Design an enzyme around this catalytic site. Sequence first.
Site, PDB file in Angstrom:
ATOM      1  N   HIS A 113       0.823  -1.206   0.000  1.00  0.00           N
ATOM      2  CA  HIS A 113       0.000   0.000   0.000  1.00  0.00           C
ATOM      3  C   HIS A 113       0.862   1.263   0.000  1.00  0.00           C
ATOM      4  O   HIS A 113       0.673   2.161  -0.825  1.00  0.00           O
ATOM      5  CB  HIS A 113      -0.940  -0.035   1.212  1.00  0.00           C
ATOM      6  CG  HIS A 113      -1.819   1.169   1.346  1.00  0.00           C
ATOM      7  ND1 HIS A 113      -3.129   1.195   0.920  1.00  0.00           N
ATOM      8  CD2 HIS A 113      -1.578   2.386   1.884  1.00  0.00           C
ATOM      9  CE1 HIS A 113      -3.652   2.379   1.186  1.00  0.00           C
ATOM     10  NE2 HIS A 113      -2.734   3.120   1.778  1.00  0.00           N
ATOM     11  N   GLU A 114       1.834   1.327   0.903  1.00  0.00           N
ATOM     12  CA  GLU A 114       2.680   2.510   0.999  1.00  0.00           C
ATOM     13  C   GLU A 114       3.525   2.741  -0.238  1.00  0.00           C
ATOM     14  O   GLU A 114       3.664   3.878  -0.685  1.00  0.00           O
ATOM     15  CB  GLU A 114       3.579   2.424   2.230  1.00  0.00           C
ATOM     16  CG  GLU A 114       2.817   2.444   3.555  1.00  0.00           C
ATOM     17  CD  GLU A 114       1.827   3.590   3.642  1.00  0.00           C
ATOM     18  OE1 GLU A 114       0.688   3.373   4.102  1.00  0.00           O
ATOM     19  OE2 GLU A 114       2.172   4.719   3.233  1.00  0.00           O
ATOM     20  N   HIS A 117       1.738   4.540  -2.849  1.00  0.00           N
ATOM     21  CA  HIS A 117       1.862   5.982  -2.667  1.00  0.00           C
ATOM     22  C   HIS A 117       3.234   6.506  -3.099  1.00  0.00           C
ATOM     23  O   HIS A 117       3.314   7.541  -3.755  1.00  0.00           O
ATOM     24  CB  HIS A 117       1.652   6.390  -1.215  1.00  0.00           C
ATOM     25  CG  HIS A 117       0.265   6.193  -0.683  1.00  0.00           C
ATOM     26  ND1 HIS A 117      -0.876   6.614  -1.330  1.00  0.00           N
ATOM     27  CD2 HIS A 117      -0.141   5.687   0.503  1.00  0.00           C
ATOM     28  CE1 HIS A 117      -1.927   6.356  -0.565  1.00  0.00           C
ATOM     29  NE2 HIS A 117      -1.509   5.793   0.555  1.00  0.00           N
ATOM     30  N   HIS A 123      -5.585   6.865  -3.046  1.00  0.00           N
ATOM     31  CA  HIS A 123      -6.472   5.838  -2.541  1.00  0.00           C
ATOM     32  C   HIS A 123      -7.566   5.475  -3.516  1.00  0.00           C
ATOM     33  O   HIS A 123      -7.986   6.286  -4.336  1.00  0.00           O
ATOM     34  CB  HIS A 123      -7.103   6.267  -1.233  1.00  0.00           C
ATOM     35  CG  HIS A 123      -6.146   6.242  -0.090  1.00  0.00           C
ATOM     36  ND1 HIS A 123      -6.208   7.138   0.951  1.00  0.00           N
ATOM     37  CD2 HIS A 123      -5.098   5.427   0.174  1.00  0.00           C
ATOM     38  CE1 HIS A 123      -5.243   6.871   1.813  1.00  0.00           C
ATOM     39  NE2 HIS A 123      -4.552   5.840   1.363  1.00  0.00           N
TER      40      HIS A 123
HETATM   41  O1  LIG Z   1      -3.450   5.822   3.997  1.00  0.00           O
HETATM   42  C1  LIG Z   1      -2.600   5.981   4.870  1.00  0.00           C
HETATM   43  C2  LIG Z   1      -2.908   6.533   6.235  1.00  0.00           C
HETATM   44  N1  LIG Z   1      -3.896   5.734   6.904  1.00  0.00           N
HETATM   45  S1  LIG Z   1      -3.678   4.294   7.566  1.00  0.00           S
HETATM   46  O2  LIG Z   1      -2.289   4.428   7.943  1.00  0.00           O
HETATM   47  O3  LIG Z   1      -4.626   4.122   8.576  1.00  0.00           O
HETATM   48  C3  LIG Z   1      -3.473   3.020   6.620  1.00  0.00           C
HETATM   49  C4  LIG Z   1      -2.263   2.519   6.128  1.00  0.00           C
HETATM   50  C5  LIG Z   1      -2.255   1.379   5.319  1.00  0.00           C
HETATM   51  C6  LIG Z   1      -3.446   0.739   4.963  1.00  0.00           C
HETATM   52  C7  LIG Z   1      -3.448  -0.510   4.152  1.00  0.00           C
HETATM   53  C8  LIG Z   1      -4.394  -0.792   3.172  1.00  0.00           C
HETATM   54  C9  LIG Z   1      -4.353  -2.007   2.483  1.00  0.00           C
HETATM   55  C10 LIG Z   1      -3.389  -2.957   2.791  1.00  0.00           C
HETATM   56  C11 LIG Z   1      -2.461  -2.692   3.791  1.00  0.00           C
HETATM   57  C12 LIG Z   1      -2.501  -1.485   4.474  1.00  0.00           C
HETATM   58  C13 LIG Z   1      -4.650   1.231   5.463  1.00  0.00           C
HETATM   59  C14 LIG Z   1      -4.658   2.368   6.266  1.00  0.00           C
HETATM   60  N2  LIG Z   1      -1.334   5.698   4.673  1.00  0.00           N
HETATM   61  O4  LIG Z   1      -0.955   5.228   3.438  1.00  0.00           O
HETATM   62 ZN   LIG Z   2      -2.727   5.150   2.152  1.00  0.00          ZN
END
Ligand SMILES: O=C(CNS(=O)(=O)c1ccc(-c2ccccc2)cc1)NO
Ligand SMILES: [Zn+2]
Length: 158
Positions: A113-114, A117, A123
Amino acid sequence: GPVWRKHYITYRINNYTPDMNREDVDYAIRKAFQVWSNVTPLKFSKINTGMADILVVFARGAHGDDHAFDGKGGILAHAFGPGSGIGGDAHFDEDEFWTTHSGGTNLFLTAVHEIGHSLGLGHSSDPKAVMFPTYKYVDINTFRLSADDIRGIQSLYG
Ligand SMILES: O=C(CNS(=O)(=O)c1ccc(-c2ccccc2)cc1)NO
Ligand SMILES: [Zn+2]
Ligand SMILES: [Ca+2]
Ligand SMILES: [Ca+2]
Ligand SMILES: [Ca+2]
Ligand SMILES: [Zn+2]
């Protein structure tokens, strides 16, 4: 938004969470990069010194950017879009308990996920997408990007 304008991308692991074996952190991050190189022309290489495109950091609370972590739960990680300096960097909240499995918060899945980004994705509204902003464990051994994720990243690369 911004994208990397080159195919060879470097990353560096700034520091290691004490939650996991060192080799498991390395492997989780490597596999997460591979998810994205599978579907783009990008090639990722780990470097051990110097300035990487993507710096991977474990930190807690306030940690020198304008974006603080919040203790266990809530925010798990964040990452900056492509660009110089802090651009691309991916930060993981050390107040989470990172793991290789379904316990705690899975590092591999979160890193996929990161890194999305870090490559310039935002998202998705699709709950099936790895870019859907709610963490949910899915079997990591059979993990696949959703069609939405592949559409998203292939709108930026290739
Ligand atoms: O979007 C964000 C901030 N929100 S989060 O950290 O709660 C978060 C982080 C990762 C994920 C995630 C989604 C899908 C798979 C693994 C992690 C969900 C929420 N950072 O990228
Ligand atoms: Zn995110
Ligand atoms: Ca947190
Ligand atoms: Ca950077
Ligand atoms: Ca921790
Ligand atoms: Zn940060």
